[PDB]
């Protein structure tokens, strides 16, 4: 099962979580690839059978500059990804007022518009209350692999 792992990150934290997720999901036997700064063309070539999106929120409440253009491109084209399984990890910040991981939530909304089915609740990580977000994500990733296949 081919799993496309997308990331949105200002300084690299969500990117590192996504990289860790790639290693864990591949260990479990999934064909998982981390596609940082992915284009629509790259995703089309990859032909994903599942999605994992790991994304922080900017100070302006938006998706980071490295995932936002792709978000808009996907929303515009609406590829035929209906029925595929997906999950989201949202790197929130409680100190800043982002407790709920706004970026993550915007990805959930996209999944809805695409017909991608969430297989787990979004993981809400709090970047202001952890120095180990990669390890914090491990229990959720353990269940996510089960949820995909199958």
Domain ranges of the chain: 1-150
Continuous segment of H or E residues that includes residue 32 = strand 31-34
Q: What is the spatial distance between Cα 55 and Cα 111, in angstroms, rounded to a whole number?
A: 14
Q: Which two tokens stand for residue 75?
A: 């929303």
The resolution, in angstroms to one decimal, equals 1.7
Q: What is the 3 state secondary structure string of 42-92?
A: HHHHHCCCEEEEEEECCCCCCCCCCCHHHHHHHHHHCCCCCCCEEEEEEEE
Please provide the size of the chain in residues. Answer: 150
Method by which the coordinates were obtained: X-ray
The CATH fold of domain 1-150? Rossmann fold (3.40.50)
């Amino acid at each position: 099962m081919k799993v496309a792992i997308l990331s949105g990150s200002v300084y690299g934290t969500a990117e590192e979580v996504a990289r860790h997720a790639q290693k864990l999901l591949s260990a479990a036997g999934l064909e998982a690839s981390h596609l940082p700064r992915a284009s629509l063309d790259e995703l089309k070539a990859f032909a994903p059978e599942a999605f994992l999106v790991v994304t922080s929120t900017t100070g302006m409440g938006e998706l980071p500059d490295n995932l936002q253009p792709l978000y808009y491109a996907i929303r515009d084209q609406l590829p035929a990804w209906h029925g595929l399984p997906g999950g989201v990890i949202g790197l929130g910040d409680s100190s800043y007022g982002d407790t709920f991981a706004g970026g993550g939530e915007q990805v959930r909304e996209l999944f809805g518009e695409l017909g991608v089915r969430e297989v787990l609740p979004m993981l809400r990580l709090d970047a202001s209350e952890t120095v180990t977000p990669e390890t914090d994500a491990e229990p959720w990733l353990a269940e996510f692999a089960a949820a995909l296949k199958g």
